[PDB]
Amino acid sequence: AQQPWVEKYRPKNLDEVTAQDHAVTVLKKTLKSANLPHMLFYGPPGTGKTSTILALTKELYGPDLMKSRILELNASDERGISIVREKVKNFARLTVSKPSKHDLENYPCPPYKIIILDEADSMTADAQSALRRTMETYSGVTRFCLICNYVTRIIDPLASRCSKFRFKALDASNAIDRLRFISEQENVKCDDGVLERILDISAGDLRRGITLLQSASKGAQYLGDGKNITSTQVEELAGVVPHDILIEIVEKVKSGDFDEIKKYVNTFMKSGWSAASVVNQLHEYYITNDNFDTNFKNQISWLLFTTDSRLNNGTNEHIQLLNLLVKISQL
Amino acid sequence: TLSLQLPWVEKYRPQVLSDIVGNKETIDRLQQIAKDGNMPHMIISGMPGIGKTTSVHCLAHELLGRSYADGVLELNASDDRGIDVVRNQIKHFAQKKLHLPPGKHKIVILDEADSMTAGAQQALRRTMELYSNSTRFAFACNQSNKIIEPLQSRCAILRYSKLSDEDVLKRLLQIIKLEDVKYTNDGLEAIIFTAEGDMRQAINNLQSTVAGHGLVNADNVFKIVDSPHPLIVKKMLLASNLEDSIQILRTDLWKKGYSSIDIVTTSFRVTKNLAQVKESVRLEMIKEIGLTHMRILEGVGTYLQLASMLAKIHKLNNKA
Amino acid sequence: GGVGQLAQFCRKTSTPLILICNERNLPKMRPFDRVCLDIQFRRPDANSIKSRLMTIAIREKFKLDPNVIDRLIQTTRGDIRQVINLLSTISTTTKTINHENINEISKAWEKNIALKPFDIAHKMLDGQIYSDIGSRNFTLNDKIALYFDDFDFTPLMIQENYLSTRPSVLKPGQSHLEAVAEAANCISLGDIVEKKIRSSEQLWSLLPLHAVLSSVYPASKVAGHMAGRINFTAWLGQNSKSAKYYRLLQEIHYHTR
Amino acid sequence: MSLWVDKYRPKSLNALSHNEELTNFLKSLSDQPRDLPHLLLYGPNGTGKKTRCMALLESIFGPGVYRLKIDVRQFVTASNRKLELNVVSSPYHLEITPSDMGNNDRIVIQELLKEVAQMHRYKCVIINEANSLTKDAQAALRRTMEKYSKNIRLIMVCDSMSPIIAPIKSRCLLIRCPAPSDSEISTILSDVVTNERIQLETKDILKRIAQASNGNLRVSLLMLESMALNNELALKSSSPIIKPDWIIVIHKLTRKIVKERSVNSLIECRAVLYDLLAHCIPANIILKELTFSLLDVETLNTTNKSSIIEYSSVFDERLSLGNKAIFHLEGFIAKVMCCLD
Amino acid sequence: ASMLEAKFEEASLFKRIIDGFKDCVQLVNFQCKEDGIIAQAVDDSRVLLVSLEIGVEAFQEYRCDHPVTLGMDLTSLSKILRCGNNTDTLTLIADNTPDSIILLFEDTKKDRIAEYSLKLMDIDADFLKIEELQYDSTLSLPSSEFSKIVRDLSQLSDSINIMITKETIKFVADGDIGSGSVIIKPFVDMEHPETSIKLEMDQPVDLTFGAKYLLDIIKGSSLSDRVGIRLSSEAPALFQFDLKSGFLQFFLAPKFN
Amino acid sequence: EKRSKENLPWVEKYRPETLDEVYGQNEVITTVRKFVDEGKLPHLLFYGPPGTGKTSTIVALAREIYGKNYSNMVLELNASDDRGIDVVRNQIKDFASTRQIFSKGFKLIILDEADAMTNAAQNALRRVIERYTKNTRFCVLANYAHKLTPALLSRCTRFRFQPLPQEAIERRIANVLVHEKLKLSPNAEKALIELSNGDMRRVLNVLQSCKATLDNPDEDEISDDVIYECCGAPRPSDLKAVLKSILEDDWGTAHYTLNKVRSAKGLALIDLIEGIVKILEDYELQNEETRVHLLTKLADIEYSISKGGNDQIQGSAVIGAIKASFENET
DNA sequence: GCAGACACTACGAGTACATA
DNA sequence: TTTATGTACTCGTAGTGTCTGC
Ligand SMILES: Nc1ncnc2c1ncn2[C@@H]1O[C@H](COP(=O)(O)OP(=O)(O)OP(O)(O)=S)[C@@H](O)[C@H]1O
Ligand SMILES: Nc1ncnc2c1ncn2[C@@H]1O[C@H](COP(=O)(O)OP(=O)(O)OP(O)(O)=S)[C@@H](O)[C@H]1O
Ligand SMILES: Nc1ncnc2c1ncn2[C@@H]1O[C@H](COP(=O)(O)OP(=O)(O)OP(O)(O)=S)[C@@H](O)[C@H]1O
Ligand SMILES: Nc1ncnc2c1ncn2[C@@H]1O[C@H](COP(=O)(O)OP(=O)(O)O)[C@@H](O)[C@H]1O
Ligand SMILES: [Mg+2]
Ligand SMILES: [Mg+2]
Ligand SMILES: [Mg+2]
């Protein structure tokens, strides 16, 4: 219990990745062979790209050859054009390490070493342009694995050279087996639909779901009542707005009266909820409703999209929330 | 590996001032300098490929003859023209005592002079002012803006202009008659249109078409070398129907293998160099093209972005 | 440290000493502010140059027309040496100088001198260049080239005096305040463009866009004569004082923590 | 020190008479600290997030977290510029802030977090004002906490959630800190004043301070101390609610905008903005205060209010993507003048 | 134990051999065989080619049953040789197609033992079969004389032109400062056999070479007392430095026109 | 390299070793072959999209002109190698000025991805090219032309590499299937053609990953269904159903249909946006305002998705944009 | 031969440009 | 004058090396 549940239950085998079945099967059938292409993993955060690549490397070489045939770089490490031109080029043009008898007999050691460039979308385009022909020339000796969560930052030539493996988002249906397994292993008392709520709140990631489950389990352990974790405790710990406050917001919006909505927004922001969660709740309330006209739904969908983009830019959420509510109120 | 034949660009490079076509007044002035001998300091500027450095070399050859091996010091960007290791070289060369004909001086061809630093030109200022009796300089730069104003204050400004179609056609016909290749006037006008007054481009396209199809007919010319995409971009931006603009975009640029960033930069250049539409309209067009440019440079390069750019350009152009 | 050594020489010298430069306003000759007896040379009046060229023309056998010297000095911008070079080069092949080819020679030998930031702001805010007639010769490409002379001061110079003029290019039904707001919008856009330019991505191909969005469009709506006079940029001094005040605030924040 | 804001601060969770549910949640985390994940406390400023962080720290290890020292660390960047940023270190934890220049705090984060990770099993790293990070140090942090976690832990404190990128939200546990209720503000101020020696005519003064503070306990304590010093250690029921001079400047600027809508008044607005930016004020808070003071003027219309708030949102988006805030603020004031006129 | 063993009599020999061509070449491709060890390496400009070869007689003990391709890097190799006492006995050790080699810097003959290892470098370029051909001329002059002549002439021009015609060696280098014309008449001396200007003649040659590359050649003059130059109009210049058991050529490419 | 072939990706295994093995660019290949047989070879400039076969063509050309060891006779510089103006002043100058070291021939300089060179480097390269062109030829491979100096563009013969047409991709796929003992249904081949978007590396990568996808590499044929799960691209039927539900059905039905389609096999909103864009471009719209609104709103949505965000809100935005754009038309 | 003298290469800090 | 990387230029310095000399 010296580690959080996120890393304690990190997959150690390729089969342990309970999502992205296509990419995992492709990588396993490649593990049987030696034709490993230059990979490019992308997708939403928490989908399991780093876990997949670490499991693949461990199954390829073994615990002994991690330090010799794996080069991992981050944005924490310096990744200027000089680093790409010298360090990566040198590590690529070096010959592979010498596998031992034990490693060769037990593990399917391939005659190449993998260069893992985590969060590679943060590099400048000049560094990627320098990396292009390094990737192309030494293909027979080294493999490049680019792990970025944004494809568009990666320039066109690298996306052309690298085989692309999209990592699908982990919704309620895909990643319920993992949460059930974690609950069984950790002996976490749970309700019926609590895990579905956890996966619903954790939008397209499993790390957030695991963290929420750990927090709920710790709270239940503190209380010590031996009670199943309800949806209310998880919903509260997740930071999403309760339905009563959302109903009050909708009632204030419907009547108009700019002063009233301004005062209620001031009080609401004093209570301090995350505005992205409020926008998500408003979207799942207004769009799924059937009491609203088509034109209203068009306009409110566009308004919610604009507010979400402006919030994602990293602005002051109070003004954006007030603007969104006032614009909806005048529809 | 057989020794390559010299390309027609270099095989038919002029060796005398008479063969240079275009800018008749400048060439006549250079000829009068040549027979007169009193060469002043000059700076030669213009668009690339219209005959700047070849006139300098021809004048240097004509003014001084057998002394060309050591009476002219030629410098270029390949030589490390810096403030320190190079001021001594020109200082020695100007201070070098060589016996010329009475009306001829040493020539320092500082070819591609727009790439030098400020300090090198600052030293060259007094270097030129001191030994004006012995040595004379010849700057040949594509852009004269990089040259500082003290250097412009003691130089003869010789501005070359882009070649007219008649002069390019005349020298092209000379090249055909020396090479005896079957030609059609439509193909020659296609070469002229593709070159855009750039002579070396015309010679290179002539080479490609001759050695690719034997006949320089217009169909073969357009098969080998494509029409200049600035003209296609200008046609696309000036269309009145949005569907027509989108179709031109797709067919002529997206299906011809043109990067989105190239289309955006060419559109910006065409818009800033366009003059038919109102000034303010060009201002909003430039603003929108720049917004699309920022979107392209930030990572998202897609046909959809160019289509949106064209749609908003039509929104501004059609006045809502 | 050449300028410091020259200044220290100026303080202590036992021989007559003079210096020849071109631009006192540069900060690298700032130490020469009160260590030398300044003598300023200006553009000479056309009469003396006219007489000198008359003597030169009658001495070198080529004919010269008196009304031509005025335009030669005007286009050459008071550069007597370049005028003599022009006379020599023209006399190489066409000894006769008349009023027919005067415009041809003036256009061929026009000097594209760089422009000072205050004069850049004055030319950018002049209402004639954005007029229909004034745009035939001074196209917006010339405006971009004029911006690119000093690309570090023009965005700051435009912003600090685009709201202290009488506008002369107001559209019908549009007030001065509306033009000020619509110019401020594009100034704010140019700020974001500059931030993308001067960042880790370092996209310097975006300079022509910043030129428009920060100088040309904002000055294309508030063009006109000055309400007062063009003032030096104050954002530099305010930013420096703010940076020092931030440093002193951090000092007291860490001391009291 | 003599200041009351830093004289009465609850050291333990037992003294946290602010939020029963949040204190219980923090005690649940502190019950088994062997697997405590990285935290991220968010909420309005002045709530007391740092107080909760220190209380949790001393509940994890024990007393002695509250003893602090200063250790200046020399950090070198591109070229040879020196931006030596001190770190407020201590036994059992380490406190850092991005008070360094934002363009190159990434190196501070990189080498300092790599240095602290060279080895009571973990040392907590509190990062005050985490919302001021420039999306580059956060990229380093993404793998910094993920790779080395059994040896280092982060308590990442920030008053806003928007600038924090998605992966940092993903790998950190989220803890919410609501602002105090007005009754709780009055109770805390009453406890402070009865532990102090200030005489009150009626508790209505505490309620007025609670209303004026707008859920901000820190400025509430500061204003109470200032009033007590000014009222000769005896509060008066008729004492005017003193405002920060910044609020006075914002309100005067709003009045000048509302009354006079000419270009000249915009010139004095620009001068006032230059002074305010010279007075160590972030652009987001000054634009927010200007917008909300403009909307509180009663002579406006609902259409003008809607236009003002929409342009305020647009120009706040511009602030989040700009360098020189003066241009964006001047543009916002110009648009407000255009709409009101 | 290890398959490849090569114990030098002294680390000084290998240090000198490596430093002979360390500067002019970045990547080296050693090819160990039972006949000896060779090293064919090409300059970055692909103008100067180095062909090292060390016979089995220069090793105190040597044994290599299977051919080994040791592609390496001279910068790190020289860095490894930089550390370690020069009197020590080096012993090259490698495995069956390894990722690295082991440098036994055995201090004196006992006590301290070093195990410096350099990771092997994957150079897939095969050895070039440029051994020799029918050379037009074959001269032989002392290394000191050639080094002095090259060093003196490099200061006068950027190109040294070597001309051989009718039993006479002539170096000319025309430049800006001047034009050296150092000439040598062949001779032989029984008193001092080391200094003897040997010569052979088939056809006259006029081949020009760069100055920096010739300086790189003469940096290796410390290895051999004599240097043998062979020239041809249809062959790169050959500079055969004779070693204790092998040699060290320098295939320099002449300029054209 | 290690273990010869069969340990390389299909991208680098099926690299053309001869000018006859380059497909698609018939005109460029024939012109280059005529050039090298007639003995004249001007300064070549290869321009085109990624994956069209530029560096493969020039490597095959250098192999044809020289012997097997083309790398011993060609100074091939790339962006990985440092290419400052000092490099141009020393390495390029020395390689161009000197004579060949292994045989009698003209020096050939290949500058792959030369668009990354600085302006001063290109300025020096201008005179380096023009001075020593007698026995040295420069080849410049550039994906982007705006990064090249116009002086450099005016000096080299321009060859444009068009995106690969259908027949070239079909021929290469047939050769790959013949080599690999693999079978593939024609509808899957058409799906590959549509998925390539003019790139050949994409085709080779998808073939490799789809062969890896199959449980039995032999016997089983690759259908378009396998292509669509392996690449993850939306199926055309799914796009048609989504668009029909958006156009005719109301908000409840359209939102439920889009969510079901996305969650059936993990589709992303991206690739679906421009699938819808292609389908809508396959329509005739009477009013230009529909086109304008569609293009602007969908470009904004695609930009926001590229910057990342909430997928549900972006899907609702897509539905709202399409439904608002197809109501202004009437 | 050891000592000084000598000029050389190598290294580090500072400044200025960045679209025609 | 802040900007914020990467490039190129320039200068200055510190040693490092061989060359003359007593
Ligand atoms: N498919 C999966 N199966 C099992 N656990 C998963 C899966 N995907 C993610 N996880 C969990 O997610 C945590 C780590 O996931 P990561 O691989 O770091 O996500 P990620 O790809 O790194 O996202 P980034 O790097 O922030 S874009 C561990 O707790 C894993 O157990
Ligand atoms: N007026 C002309 N008459 C004949 N040939 C010309 C003329 N102008 C250019 N050329 C040809 O252009 C080629 C070389 O032109 P250059 O003068 O070297 O180009 P340039 O003027 O120097 O432009 P840049 O800036 O150097 S690229 C030769 O093949 C010449 O024959
Ligand atoms: N016309 C073609 N015929 C056959 N294979 C091709 C063709 N074009 C591209 N390829 C394949 O594409 C692979 C990689 O493309 P390359 O030609 O090496 O690079 P490129 O096409 O020049 O793209 P860039 O611009 O260098 S990233 C080659 O190894 C070939 O297998
Ligand atoms: N439970 C509490 N009881 C009394 N005062 C409190 C309590 N919690 C916080 N405070 C007050 O909050 C102040 C510290 O606030 P701080 O943590 O600096 O807010 P922020 O983190 O938003 O800057 C202290 O002066 C302390 O008096
Ligand atoms: Mg990861
Ligand atoms: Mg030229
Ligand atoms: Mg290539």
Side-chain angles (χ1 to χ4, degrees), chain A residues 1 7 10 72 119 207-208 214 271 310 313-314 316-317 320, chain D residues 34-35 139 142 146-147 149 160 169-171 176 313 317 320:
Chain A
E7 56 203 64
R10 172 172 298 229
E72 171 183 76
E119 65 183 1
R207 183 163 45 193
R208 173 166 292 286
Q214 184 188 5
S271 176
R310 287 180 184 165
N313 276 359
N316 187 0
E317 69 275 16
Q320 311 290 335
Chain D
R34 266 261 313 271
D35 62 358
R142 291 170 82 263
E146 185 169 350
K147 190 197 318 282
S149 61
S160 179
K169 288 176 170 56
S170 172
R171 55 195 69 249
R176 205 180 58 86
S313 162
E317 183 179 2
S320 172

Short mmCIF file of all heavy atoms in Angstrom, two decimals, chain A residues 1 7 10 72 119 207-208 214 271 310 313-314 316-317 320, chain D residues 34-35 139 142 146-147 149 160 169-171 176 313 317 320:
data_model
loop_
_atom_site.label_atom_id
_atom_site.label_comp_id
_atom_site.label_asym_id
_atom_site.label_seq_id
_atom_site.Cartn_x
_atom_site.Cartn_y
_atom_site.Cartn_z
N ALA A 1 0.83 -1.20 0.00
CA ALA A 1 0.00 0.00 0.00
C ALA A 1 0.86 1.25 0.00
O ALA A 1 0.44 2.31 0.46
CB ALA A 1 -0.94 0.00 1.20
N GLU A 7 -1.11 3.70 -9.95
CA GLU A 7 0.10 3.00 -10.37
C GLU A 7 0.23 1.61 -9.77
O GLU A 7 0.97 0.78 -10.32
CB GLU A 7 1.33 3.83 -9.98
CG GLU A 7 1.39 4.15 -8.50
CD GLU A 7 2.23 5.37 -8.21
OE1 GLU A 7 1.86 6.47 -8.67
OE2 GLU A 7 3.25 5.22 -7.51
N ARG A 10 -1.40 -0.56 -12.33
CA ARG A 10 -0.97 -0.32 -13.71
C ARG A 10 -0.71 -1.66 -14.39
O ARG A 10 -0.11 -2.56 -13.78
CB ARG A 10 0.28 0.55 -13.73
CG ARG A 10 0.93 0.71 -15.09
CD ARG A 10 2.03 1.75 -15.05
NE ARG A 10 1.53 3.07 -14.69
CZ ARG A 10 1.79 4.18 -15.35
NH1 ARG A 10 2.57 4.17 -16.43
NH2 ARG A 10 1.28 5.33 -14.93
N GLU A 72 13.93 6.66 -23.23
CA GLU A 72 12.68 7.39 -23.02
C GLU A 72 12.98 8.86 -22.76
O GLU A 72 13.84 9.18 -21.93
CB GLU A 72 11.90 6.79 -21.84
CG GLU A 72 10.70 7.60 -21.41
CD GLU A 72 9.99 7.00 -20.21
OE1 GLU A 72 10.52 7.13 -19.08
OE2 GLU A 72 8.92 6.40 -20.39
N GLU A 119 4.96 12.31 -24.90
CA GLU A 119 4.44 13.67 -25.05
C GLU A 119 5.21 14.46 -26.11
O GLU A 119 5.63 15.60 -25.92
CB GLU A 119 4.40 14.39 -23.68
CG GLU A 119 5.73 14.65 -22.98
CD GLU A 119 5.55 15.29 -21.62
OE1 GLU A 119 4.39 15.51 -21.22
OE2 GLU A 119 6.56 15.53 -20.94
N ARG A 207 -7.83 6.54 -15.39
CA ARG A 207 -7.04 7.02 -14.25
C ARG A 207 -7.90 7.84 -13.30
O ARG A 207 -7.81 7.69 -12.08
CB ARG A 207 -5.86 7.83 -14.76
CG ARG A 207 -4.93 8.34 -13.68
CD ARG A 207 -3.60 8.76 -14.29
NE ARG A 207 -3.80 9.54 -15.50
CZ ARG A 207 -2.84 9.82 -16.38
NH1 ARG A 207 -1.60 9.39 -16.20
NH2 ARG A 207 -3.13 10.55 -17.45
N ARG A 208 -8.75 8.72 -13.85
CA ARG A 208 -9.65 9.50 -13.01
C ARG A 208 -10.64 8.60 -12.29
O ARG A 208 -10.95 8.83 -11.11
CB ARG A 208 -10.38 10.54 -13.86
CG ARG A 208 -11.47 11.30 -13.12
CD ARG A 208 -11.90 12.53 -13.89
NE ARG A 208 -10.85 13.54 -13.95
CZ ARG A 208 -10.49 14.31 -12.93
NH1 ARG A 208 -11.08 14.22 -11.75
NH2 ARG A 208 -9.51 15.19 -13.11
N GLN A 214 -10.58 5.24 -5.36
CA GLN A 214 -9.69 5.23 -4.21
C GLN A 214 -10.14 6.24 -3.16
O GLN A 214 -10.13 5.95 -1.96
CB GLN A 214 -8.26 5.52 -4.65
CG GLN A 214 -7.24 5.44 -3.52
CD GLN A 214 -5.87 5.91 -3.94
OE1 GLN A 214 -5.67 6.39 -5.05
NE2 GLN A 214 -4.90 5.78 -3.04
N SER A 271 -19.47 29.73 -4.00
CA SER A 271 -19.44 28.33 -3.56
C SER A 271 -18.35 27.53 -4.27
O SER A 271 -17.95 26.48 -3.78
CB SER A 271 -20.80 27.67 -3.79
OG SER A 271 -20.74 26.30 -3.45
N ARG A 310 -13.80 28.60 -25.06
CA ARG A 310 -13.20 29.73 -24.36
C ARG A 310 -12.68 29.32 -22.99
O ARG A 310 -11.63 29.80 -22.55
CB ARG A 310 -14.20 30.87 -24.25
CG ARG A 310 -14.45 31.60 -25.56
CD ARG A 310 -15.46 32.72 -25.40
NE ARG A 310 -15.77 33.35 -26.67
CZ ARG A 310 -16.80 34.15 -26.88
NH1 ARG A 310 -17.65 34.44 -25.91
NH2 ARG A 310 -16.99 34.67 -28.09
N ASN A 313 -9.46 27.49 -23.40
CA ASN A 313 -8.32 28.37 -23.62
C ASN A 313 -7.62 28.72 -22.31
O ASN A 313 -6.43 29.07 -22.32
CB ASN A 313 -8.76 29.64 -24.34
CG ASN A 313 -8.82 29.46 -25.85
OD1 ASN A 313 -8.51 28.39 -26.37
ND2 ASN A 313 -9.22 30.52 -26.55
N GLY A 314 -8.33 28.64 -21.19
CA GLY A 314 -7.73 28.94 -19.90
C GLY A 314 -8.00 30.36 -19.43
O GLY A 314 -7.07 31.07 -19.02
N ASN A 316 -10.72 33.37 -17.35
CA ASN A 316 -11.46 33.54 -16.10
C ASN A 316 -12.85 32.94 -16.27
O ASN A 316 -13.65 33.44 -17.06
CB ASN A 316 -11.53 35.01 -15.71
CG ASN A 316 -12.14 35.24 -14.34
OD1 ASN A 316 -12.51 34.29 -13.65
ND2 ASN A 316 -12.24 36.50 -13.95
N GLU A 317 -13.14 31.89 -15.51
CA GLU A 317 -14.36 31.12 -15.71
C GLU A 317 -15.61 31.85 -15.24
O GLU A 317 -16.71 31.53 -15.71
CB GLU A 317 -14.23 29.77 -15.00
CG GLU A 317 -14.22 29.86 -13.49
CD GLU A 317 -12.84 30.15 -12.91
OE1 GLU A 317 -11.95 30.58 -13.67
OE2 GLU A 317 -12.66 29.96 -11.69
N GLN A 320 -16.97 33.95 -18.21
CA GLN A 320 -17.47 33.06 -19.25
C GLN A 320 -18.79 32.41 -18.84
O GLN A 320 -19.72 32.32 -19.65
CB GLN A 320 -16.43 31.98 -19.58
CG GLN A 320 -15.04 32.53 -19.83
CD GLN A 320 -14.95 33.29 -21.13
OE1 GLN A 320 -15.72 33.07 -22.06
NE2 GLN A 320 -13.99 34.21 -21.21
N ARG D 34 -0.04 6.29 3.72
CA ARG D 34 0.92 5.48 2.99
C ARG D 34 0.68 5.51 1.48
O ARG D 34 1.62 5.28 0.72
CB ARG D 34 0.89 4.04 3.49
CG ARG D 34 1.92 3.74 4.57
CD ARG D 34 3.14 3.05 3.98
NE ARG D 34 2.77 1.95 3.10
CZ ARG D 34 2.58 0.70 3.50
NH1 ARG D 34 2.72 0.35 4.76
NH2 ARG D 34 2.24 -0.22 2.60
N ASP D 35 -0.55 5.78 1.05
CA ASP D 35 -0.89 5.81 -0.37
C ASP D 35 -1.65 7.08 -0.72
O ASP D 35 -2.64 7.06 -1.45
CB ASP D 35 -1.68 4.56 -0.77
CG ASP D 35 -3.02 4.44 -0.04
OD1 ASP D 35 -3.34 5.29 0.81
OD2 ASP D 35 -3.75 3.47 -0.33
N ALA D 139 3.93 20.30 -18.63
CA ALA D 139 4.33 19.17 -19.47
C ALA D 139 5.43 18.35 -18.80
O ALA D 139 5.41 17.12 -18.85
CB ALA D 139 4.78 19.67 -20.84
N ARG D 142 3.87 16.33 -15.90
CA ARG D 142 3.09 15.17 -16.33
C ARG D 142 3.84 13.87 -16.09
O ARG D 142 3.31 12.92 -15.51
CB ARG D 142 2.74 15.30 -17.81
CG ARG D 142 1.75 16.39 -18.16
CD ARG D 142 1.68 16.57 -19.67
NE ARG D 142 0.79 15.60 -20.30
CZ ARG D 142 1.19 14.47 -20.86
NH1 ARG D 142 2.47 14.14 -20.91
NH2 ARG D 142 0.29 13.66 -21.40
N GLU D 146 4.41 11.15 -12.50
CA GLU D 146 4.03 9.80 -12.90
C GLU D 146 5.19 8.82 -12.76
O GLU D 146 5.01 7.69 -12.30
CB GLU D 146 3.49 9.80 -14.33
CG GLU D 146 2.95 8.46 -14.79
CD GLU D 146 2.20 8.55 -16.11
OE1 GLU D 146 1.94 9.68 -16.56
OE2 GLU D 146 1.86 7.49 -16.68
N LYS D 147 6.40 9.25 -13.15
CA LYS D 147 7.55 8.35 -13.08
C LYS D 147 7.99 8.13 -11.64
O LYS D 147 7.98 7.00 -11.14
CB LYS D 147 8.70 8.92 -13.92
CG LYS D 147 9.86 7.96 -14.12
CD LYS D 147 11.12 8.69 -14.57
CE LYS D 147 10.82 9.75 -15.62
NZ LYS D 147 10.61 9.15 -16.96
N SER D 149 6.99 8.62 -8.03
CA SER D 149 5.83 8.87 -7.17
C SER D 149 6.00 8.31 -5.77
O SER D 149 5.51 8.90 -4.81
CB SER D 149 4.58 8.27 -7.82
OG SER D 149 4.74 6.88 -7.96
N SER D 160 -7.76 28.67 -9.61
CA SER D 160 -8.58 28.50 -10.79
C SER D 160 -8.23 27.19 -11.48
O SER D 160 -7.11 26.69 -11.36
CB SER D 160 -8.42 29.67 -11.77
OG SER D 160 -9.22 29.49 -12.92
N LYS D 169 -5.00 17.59 -14.59
CA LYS D 169 -6.27 17.29 -13.95
C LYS D 169 -6.48 15.79 -13.80
O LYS D 169 -7.08 15.34 -12.82
CB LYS D 169 -7.43 17.88 -14.75
CG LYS D 169 -7.56 19.39 -14.70
CD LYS D 169 -8.69 19.84 -15.63
CE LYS D 169 -9.03 21.30 -15.44
NZ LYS D 169 -7.85 22.18 -15.62
N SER D 170 -5.98 15.01 -14.75
CA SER D 170 -6.24 13.57 -14.75
C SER D 170 -5.43 12.85 -13.68
O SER D 170 -5.96 11.98 -12.99
CB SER D 170 -5.94 12.99 -16.13
OG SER D 170 -6.00 11.57 -16.11
N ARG D 171 -4.16 13.20 -13.53
CA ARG D 171 -3.28 12.46 -12.63
C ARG D 171 -3.30 12.99 -11.20
O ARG D 171 -2.61 12.43 -10.34
CB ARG D 171 -1.84 12.47 -13.15
CG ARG D 171 -1.28 13.86 -13.40
CD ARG D 171 -0.01 13.78 -14.24
NE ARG D 171 -0.29 13.37 -15.61
CZ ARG D 171 0.06 12.20 -16.13
NH1 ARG D 171 0.70 11.30 -15.41
NH2 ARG D 171 -0.24 11.94 -17.40
N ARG D 176 -12.14 20.29 -3.43
CA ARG D 176 -12.87 21.53 -3.62
C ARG D 176 -12.92 22.30 -2.30
O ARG D 176 -13.23 21.72 -1.25
CB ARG D 176 -14.28 21.25 -4.13
CG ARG D 176 -14.90 22.39 -4.91
CD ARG D 176 -16.30 22.03 -5.37
NE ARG D 176 -17.17 21.69 -4.26
CZ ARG D 176 -17.86 22.57 -3.55
NH1 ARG D 176 -17.81 23.87 -3.83
NH2 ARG D 176 -18.62 22.15 -2.55
N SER D 313 -16.12 38.90 -22.05
CA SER D 313 -15.69 37.52 -22.28
C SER D 313 -14.69 37.43 -23.43
O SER D 313 -13.67 36.74 -23.33
CB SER D 313 -16.90 36.63 -22.56
OG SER D 313 -16.51 35.42 -23.18
N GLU D 317 -10.76 36.29 -23.06
CA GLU D 317 -10.13 35.29 -23.91
C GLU D 317 -8.87 35.86 -24.56
O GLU D 317 -7.85 35.16 -24.67
CB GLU D 317 -11.10 34.83 -24.99
CG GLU D 317 -10.56 33.74 -25.90
CD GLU D 317 -11.57 33.30 -26.94
OE1 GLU D 317 -12.68 33.87 -26.97
OE2 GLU D 317 -11.26 32.37 -27.72
N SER D 320 -6.06 35.89 -22.07
CA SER D 320 -5.46 34.57 -21.85
C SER D 320 -4.50 34.17 -22.96
O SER D 320 -3.73 33.22 -22.77
CB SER D 320 -6.54 33.51 -21.70
OG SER D 320 -5.97 32.22 -21.67
#
